[PDB]
Paper text:
Secretory-pathway Ca2+-ATPases (SPCAs) play critical roles in maintaining Ca2+ homeostasis, but the exact mechanism of SPCAs-mediated Ca2+ transport remains unclear. Here, we determined six cryo-electron microscopy (cryo-EM) structures of human SPCA1 (hSPCA1) in a series of intermediate states, revealing a near-complete conformational cycle. The overall structure of hSPCA1 is typical of a P-type ATPase, with ten transmembrane (TM) helices (TM1–TM10) and three conserved cytosolic domains: the actuator (A), phosphorylation (P), and nucleotide-binding (N) domains. Structural analysis revealed that the Ca2+ coordinates with the side-chain oxygen atoms of several residues, including Glu308, Asn738, and Asp742, and the main-chain carbonyl oxygen atoms of other residues, including Val303, Ala304, and Ile306, consistent with the results reported by Chen et al. We also found that the Ca2+-binding site in hSPCA1 corresponds to site II in hSERCA2.
These structures had resolutions of 3.59 Å, 3.52 Å, and 3.71 Å, respectively. The hydrolysis of ATP and transfer of a phosphate group to Asp350 in hSPCA1 resulted in the CaE1P-ADP state. The fact that the cytosolic headpiece remains open and that the TMD remains almost stationary in SPCAs during the phosphorylation reaction CaE1 → CaE1-ATP → CaE1P-ADP may represent a key feature that distinguishes them from other P-type II ATPases, such as SERCAs and NKAs. The N domain binds an ATP molecule and rotates ~57.0°, followed by ATP hydrolysis and phosphorylation of Asp350.
Numbering used by the authors: 17 to 130, 134 to 909
The structure:
């Protein structure tokens, strides 16, 4: 059997011993059968899933709520009293309440169980595959590049200037350097001296590494520490504690009102038992005992609906601030535009204009100069630019797939169209200066493969303003002349003409050494934008949010794209990158609400901009994707990391990520969050309206005479129907398309507004008026009849049902939506109707409850009169929509 060795054993033993003991191939790797055997033997590369849930313990913990315990105490002291029906009814009712609370808790636990398995790169069968870190087995060959995180315990056998961040493991802010040499047995006392082992969960900052898996899952003390630190957390949502405070205030007000009405009923009154029972009923009915449950389940359904649309968001409280945003920055490449570059226009230093046809990275296409087809080395000016773009290239084309930068793949395809694919191997690359964000140029110094006696030739490419600083001469009609200022102005004007059409400009120069280069020409690398982003950005800035652009390119093409998709209003400015560099946050904070395009910028500037965006009243939505951009995401409130082109540093230490990079997904998530908030507001509105109506009805009933026709069991059933399946049906709801045009909700604003208060008060007074009308119409000279109680109970039930029906959406009436789209509402409605009809006619229940019989014409009159609240709500909604239309028409 293969033994599992610890970290110190792999540290003290050389690479040969750790390879022979583990039987791991450094170059070939392990086979599929051996990997499957090791996975079946040692298990999966995850923490031990040993967690049992005593569902019976949860069921009994659903008890002990003081109010239901006082209800059970009343029930048992009633058993002591010479009576049986009230006791058994109260016991069955409290049983239904406990089981509905338990199933609600189980559903909330399921929703809270409802982001991703972490992927990695592994070398198996001699090939590198992008596989799951969960299926990793001890002995696999793992490659770690910049950005990638260490999946499991790794024994380093190859390392190039590797620096790994271990602050999450030991707390040191300084990354330690890794080496492949074995450490002596004397220095293995502390953890910081272990520079030959890559531990699980560590973050690789820089460098490259190739190691062998030695420890997975449980076979690591650091793995145990991680399992115990990142398993039990409690990141409560600000909206959650806000709703908790609101519910506590409502409960305190309800308890005060109940104490007041009890003091009133005690004076000039008797039958203390019924008063205490009805007080307990009002206490269990008025208070919201399901607000956290419904808010959690609606947040979970919202996050599930938004991840269904390819939008993964961690840090659940972020869903609270999702949609509250008002400034959403974006980059040109990636989110706002697909990563596809195509060379279309070529401008040589001689003044020639060449057009390149064909779309895609293939050999299909031709170069036309003044009507003539240029192939091979027919035109010196064009062929020089082609060879300069080809010899200085890091991307490679294979089976129409590009490996590297797409901007270099564009020049690769351009050389392919001219039949110059085999030129890149004709030169021997000697010196390389790669393309960096600070220098913005890439240079290669090479010699010919068969003409090594010739002087070394260096080719530089990049931005015009950076390349032209190294150019001293130019070519015209085959003659090398000196670069005058007029030639520089002509080149700048041509760059402006190219940028005005939305083409990325790229300058190229060639020479014997750096500093005495001749400038060959410019190329127009067009970038087709994604389809559908135009209308999205149009409807985004039309109300609420404002989109920015951090491209890092020149101002010309940036403004061209921002005008094509639509970002530049008549009153808008644009700032450079050197302007942000030589300026503090205070002076910048006064020009940010006007600027919308950031050209010639860099991620190093982004953080600073964020500070300015944090100076005034606003919240940031960044879109960092590459390296050295995770700190900007952490400093901002939320950070949008891309899935395809995204490192692990900017993925795990970040916020909501977007797979299948696009721009409308943020808008969809914003609409989802706003719909969640609207559903929560509608549920709170319905609950508060029903509670206020019941409280004022009970008060007007027990005021000075004519005691309440609603008994304890009836009010408890009303509580069940107010906080049951028809209650949470309002929380979960498919959103319509109206909130994207609404202004964003401020963080200072609460969930209760003036119109909501007016609506709940109108609903309550209508309920009370209808109930009093029914009470007056049922009896004229009759003191007390059970038919009166039945009529009042069924009337209040039907009124609550119609009020819940009218409370489907605060911005949409019942006519626009149908009897679908969360049909669970209609399911709960029909279930409650069946339960009510069973309560009406059931001889075994007629002794339990108060209802014993009813008439058909009485039921018809009840359904005819109950629609008053519904018609009033629809009338006020129609007049509000008419006022909205007449105010937008002017
Ligand atoms: N491989 C490269 N060689 C030389 N110059 C480049 C290369 N790639 C990009 N550039 C230039 O450097 C600029 C900066 O690129 P980057 O900072 O990655 O932003 P973006 O790619 O979105 O423009 C580009 O606008 C382009 O002019
Ligand atoms: F892809 Al960029 F700045 F937009 F590096
Ligand atoms: Ca209640």
């Amino acid at each position: 059997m293969i033994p599992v060795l610890t970290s110190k054993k792999a540290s003290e033993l050389p690479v040969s011993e750790v390879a022979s003991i583990l039987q791991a191939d450094l170059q070939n790797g392990l086979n599929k059968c051996e990997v499957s055997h090791r996975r079946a033997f040692h298990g999966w590369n995850e923490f031990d899933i040993s967690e049992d849930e005593p569902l019976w313990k949860k069921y009994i913990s659903q008890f002990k709520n003081p109010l239901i315990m006082l209800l059970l105490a009343s029930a048992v002291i009633s058993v002591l009293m010479h009576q049986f029906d009230d006791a058994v009814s109260i016991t069955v009712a409290i049983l239904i309440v406990v089981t509905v609370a338990f199933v609600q808790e189980y559903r909330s636990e399921k929703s809270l169980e409802e982001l991703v398995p972490p992927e990695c790169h592994c070398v198996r069968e001699g090939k590198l595959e992008h596989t799951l870190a969960r299926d990793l087995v001890p002995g696999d060959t793992v490659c770690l590049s910049v950005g990638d995180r260490v999946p499991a315990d790794l024994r380093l056998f190859e390392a190039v200037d590797l620096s790994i961040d271990e602050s999450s493991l030991t707390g040191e802010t300084t990354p330690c350097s890794k080496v492949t040499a074995p450490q002596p047995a004397a220095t293995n006392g502390d953890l910081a001296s272990r520079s030959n082992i890559a531990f699980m969960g560590t973050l690789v900052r820089c460098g490259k590494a190739k190691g062998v898996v030695i420890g997975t899952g449980e076979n690591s003390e650091f793995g145990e520490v991680f399992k115990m630190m990142q398993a039990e957390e409690a990141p409560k949502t600000p909206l959650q504690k806000s709703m908790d405070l609101l519910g506590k205030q409502l409960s305190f007000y309800s308890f005060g009102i109940i104490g007041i009405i009890m003091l009133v009923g005690w004076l000039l009154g008797k039958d203390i038992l019924e008063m205490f029972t009805i007080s307990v009923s009002l206490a269990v009915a008025a208070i919201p005992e399901g607000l956290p449950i419904v808010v959690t389940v609606t947040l979970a359904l919202g996050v599930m609906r938004m991840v269904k649309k390819r939008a993964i968001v961690k840090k659940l409280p972020i869903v609270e601030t999702l949609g509250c945003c008002n400034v959403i920055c974006s980059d040109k490449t990636g989110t706002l535009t697909k990563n596809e570059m195509t060379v279309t226009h070529i401008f040589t230093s001689d003044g020639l204009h060449a057009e390149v046809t064909g779309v895609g990275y293939n050999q299909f296409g031709e170069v036309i100069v003044d009507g003539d087809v240029v192939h091979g080395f027919y035109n010196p000016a064009v062929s020089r630019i082609v060879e300069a773009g080809c010899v200085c290239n890091d991307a490679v084309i294979r089976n129409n797939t590009l490996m590297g930068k797409p901007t270099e793949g564009a020049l690769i395809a351009l050389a392919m169209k001219m039949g110059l694919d085999g030129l890149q191997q004709d030169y021997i690359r000697k010196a390389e200066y790669p393309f960096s964000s600070e220098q913005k140029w890439m240079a290669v110094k090479c010699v010919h493969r068969t003409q090594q006696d010739r002087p070394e030739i260096c080719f530089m490419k990049g931005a015009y303003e950076q390349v032209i600083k190294y150019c001293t001469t130019y070519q015209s009609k085959g003659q090398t002349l000196t670069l005058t200022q007029q030639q520089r102005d002509v080149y700048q004007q041509e760059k402006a003409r190219m940028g005005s059409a939305g083409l990325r400009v790229l300058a190229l120069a060639s020479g014997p050494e750096l500093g005495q280069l001749t400038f060959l020409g410019l190329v127009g690398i067009i970038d087709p934008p994604r389809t559908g982003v135009k209308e999205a950005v149009t409807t985004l800035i039309a109300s609420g949010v404002s989109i920015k652009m951090i491209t890092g390119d020149s101002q010309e093409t940036a403004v061209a794209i921002a005008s094509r998709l639509g970002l530049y209003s008549k009153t808008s400015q644009s700032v450079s990158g050197e302007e942000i560099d030589a300026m503090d946050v205070q002076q910048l904070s006064q020009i940010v609400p006007k600027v919308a395009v950031f050209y010639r910028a860099s991620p190093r500037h982004k953080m600073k901009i964020i500070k300015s965006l944090q100076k005034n009243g606003s919240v940031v939505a960044m879109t960092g994707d590459g390296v050295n951009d995770a700190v900007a995401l952490k400093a901002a409130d939320i950070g949008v990391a891309m899935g395809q082109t995204g490192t692990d540093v900017c993925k795990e230490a970040a916020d909501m990520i977007l797979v299948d990079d696009d721009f409308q997904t943020i808008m969809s998530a914003i609409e989802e969050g706003k719909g969640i908030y609207n559903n929560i507001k509608n549920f709170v509105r319905f609950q508060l309206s029903t509670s206020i109506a019941a409280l004022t009805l009970i008060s007007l009933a027990t005021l000075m005479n004519f005691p309440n026709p609603l008994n304890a069991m009836q009010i408890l059933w009303i509580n069940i129907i107010m906080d049951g399946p028809p209650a949470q049906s309002l929380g979960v709801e498919p959103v319509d398309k109206d909130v994207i045009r609404k202004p964003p909700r401020n963080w200072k604003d609460s969930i209760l507004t003036k119109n909501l208060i007016l609506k709940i008060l109108v609903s309550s007074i209508i309920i009370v008026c209808g109930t009093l009308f029914v009470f007056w119409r049922e009896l004229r000279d009759n003191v007390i009849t059970p038919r009166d109680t039945t009529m009042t109970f069924t009337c209040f039930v039907f009124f609550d049902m119609f009020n819940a029906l009218s409370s489907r959406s605060q911005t949409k009436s019942v006519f626009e939506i149908g009897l679908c789209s969360n049909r669970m509402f209609c399911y709960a409605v029909l279930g409650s109707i069946m339960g009510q009809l069973l309560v009406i006619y059931f001889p075994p229940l007629q002794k339990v409850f108060q209802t014993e019989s009813l008439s058909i014409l009485d039921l018809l009159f009840l359904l005819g009169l109950t629609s008053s609240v519904c018609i009033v709500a629809e009338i006020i909604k129609k007049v509000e929509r008419s006022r909205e239309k007449i105010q937008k028409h002017v």
